[PDB]
């Protein structure tokens, strides 16, 4: 109700949804009154939208003589608010200013699905930067959805490769109840089973389950302890933290190695307070290095000179808990006035996903550029072929789109509009006495695994045989070494002529 927009004029207008405010509380969810202003997921992504469009307009190589504008709306990280604002996007399209050509975001995969179900109807291509659900890969259900992030399937794939490179052929599995945990754990099960890796037993739990529940989970994990020591955890951070708290409660710290998903990448809010339990853990962290020019632009911003971000003044007065004296959006209830010495440089922390926001914006730009070159060959600008822009053709060109990203990464979409994954493998090492910190140990680039080795742990069910493998009603990795007859030769690992005698190798 009663929402402002951040707009910028241009020949082509690109929409975007960012959670500039927290989602409503359960009382005010029906009134859709959102919470406080958000800096990293909000203000910074908004300013990045604006300044990246500035840069692309100033780029002569990319869309020459074509200006890109934008309509930026507040999603509140909530599906009701997001659907509201997307209806506001297609408002003008219904009656038949400057309709929306594409949309950037939103953040949550569920909210992204809700927005996609509406955007697909009016053939509006959507490019997301943090929604990683595998559900979004089905292009019969989400035809105009594309993302510049790898799906959770890539996290499962990278963990399977990590398990391969350390001969961890028998491991336990825990995942968090929900879309993330179950989708990722199913992908892990499939990929590890195809690679000859066995699961002792798979478990599932919510982060909010009691100390009761995590104690039961840790005891059941101990049930497998002699053989399966590595616990592949496709888990959001608080599940890992609960396992660490259970390891504290039972005194079982350091009898397992946890293989964490991106839900616990280098998040200190998970290991803080229980570092000693978590030491030795290996995690996956989505690689996204900081963008320098965004800091250059953003840190210079003053509320007196920001004449295009409507939320920037409540943001400023909430950041330094002061009162902008005599300003249009001056807020009372602050007990001090804002100094001219206040700067955003003070305790600055760039958004973790900034590179992905910027790459989604560049994806939209390069798609428009390639469409322009295919429909208006001899032109430098919009010809009548792109008046108006056919969302079908824009999707067709975006699926073909391919650039070099903000950090040098070549950005590219597969037949499902999915982007390849580059994560960095972290180790939560003990850095001396009473200091614990995450350490970059490796890199996983779209299947190519490189690890800065010698930084062991054995998790196998059975040892290799000498001269055949035979299995009971149990799993393929748990075998018994049964010898063969004197006239028999080893055909293969699992299964065992006249005038000849078995060779000295028993081949």
């Amino acid at each position, epitope marked *: 109700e009663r929402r402002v927009v951040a707009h910028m004029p241009g020949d082509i207008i690109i929409g975007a949804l960012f959670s500039v405010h927290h989602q409503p509380t359960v009382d005010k969810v029906h009134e859709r009154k959102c919470g406080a202003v958000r800096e990293q997921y909000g203000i910074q992504r908004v300013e990045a939208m604006l300044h990246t469009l500035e840069r692309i307009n100033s780029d002569p190589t990319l869309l020459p003589n074509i200006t890109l504008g934008c309509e930026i709306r507040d999603s509140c990280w909530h599906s009701a608010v997001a659907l509201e604002q997307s209806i506001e996007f297609i408002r003008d399209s219904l009656i038949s200013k400057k309709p929306i050509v594409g949309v950037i975001g939103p953040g949550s995969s569920s909210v992204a699905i809700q927005v996609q179900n509406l955007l697909q109807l009016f053939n509006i291509p959507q490019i997301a930067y943090s929604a990683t659900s595998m559900d979004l890969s089905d292009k019969t259900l989400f035809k105009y959805f594309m993302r510049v992030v790898p799906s959770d399937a890539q996290q499962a794939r990278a963990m399977v490769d990590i398990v391969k490179r350390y001969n961890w052929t028998y491991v336990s599995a825990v995942h968090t109840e929900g879309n993330y945990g179950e989708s990722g754990m199913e992908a892990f099960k499939d990929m590890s089973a195809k690679e000859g890796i066995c699961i002792a037993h798979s478990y599932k739990i919510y982060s909010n389950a009691g100390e009761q529940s995590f104690d039961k989970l840790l005891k059941k994990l101990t049930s497998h302890l002699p053989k399966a020591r590595v616990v592949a955890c496709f888990c959001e951070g608080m599940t890992v933290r609960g396992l660490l708290m259970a390891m504290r409660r039972l005194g079982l710290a350091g009898e397992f190695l946890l293989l964490g998903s991106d839900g616990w990448a280098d998040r200190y809010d998970v290991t803080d307070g229980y570092q000693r339990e978590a030491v030795g853990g290996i995690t996956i962290k989505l690689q996204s290095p900081d963008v320098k020019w965004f800091d250059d632009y953003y840190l210079k911003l003053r509320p007196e000179t920001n*004449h295009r971000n409507p939320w920037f003044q409540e943001f400023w007065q909430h950041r330094f808990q002061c009162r902008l004296e*005599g300003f249009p959006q001056e807020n009372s209830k602050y007990n001090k006035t804002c100094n001219s010495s206040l700067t955003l440089k003070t305790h600055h922390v760039q958004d973790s996903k900034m590179g992905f926001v910027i790459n989604a914006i560049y994806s939209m730009a390069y798609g428009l550029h390639n469409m322009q070159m295919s429909l208006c060959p001899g032109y430098a600008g919009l010809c009548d072929a792109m008046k108006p822009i056919d969302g079908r053709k824009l999707l067709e060109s975006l699926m073909k789109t391919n650039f070099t990203g903000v950090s040098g990464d070549t950005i590219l979409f597969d037949e499902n509009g999915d982007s390849p994954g580059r994560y960095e493998i972290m180790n939560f090492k003990e850095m001396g006495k009473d200091y614990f910190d995450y350490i970059n140990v490796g890199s996983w680039d779209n299947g190519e695994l490189k690890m800065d080795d010698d930084e062991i742990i054995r998790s196998v069910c059975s040892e290799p045989c000498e001269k055949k493998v035979i299995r009971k009603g149990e799993v393929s990795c748990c075998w018994t070494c049964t010898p063969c007859k004197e006239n028999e030769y080893v055909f293969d690992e699992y299964t065992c002529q006249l005038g000849s005698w078995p060779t000295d190798d028993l081949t």
Partner: nanobody
Amino acid sequence: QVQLVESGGGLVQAGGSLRLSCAASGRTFTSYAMGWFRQAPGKERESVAAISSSGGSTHYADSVKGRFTISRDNSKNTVYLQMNSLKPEDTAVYYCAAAMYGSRWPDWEYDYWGQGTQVTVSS
């Protein structure tokens, strides 16, 4: 686009009181700070009063402090200028303006203007 429409002006005997109303169109009103202006013939336009988007933060020019009070009803999308102790040197067309960004008043970036209502202060 937002529309601003003034009303309440007319002829008023000096030393009297007069209340100007500014009605806005659109549900964005609660997001705009408001300012009153006045243009007298042969004189440059001056700022009279201003109020922030939330209300509860009012600013007045030195020539009208202690006589005018600016207010706003957000449930009605209306701004109000109560003018007391009217002097003949107040006779002018009063305008209503909406601004969203800007520095300390009167240095605001006014995005929308009204048509204006005449206030004639007879002696």
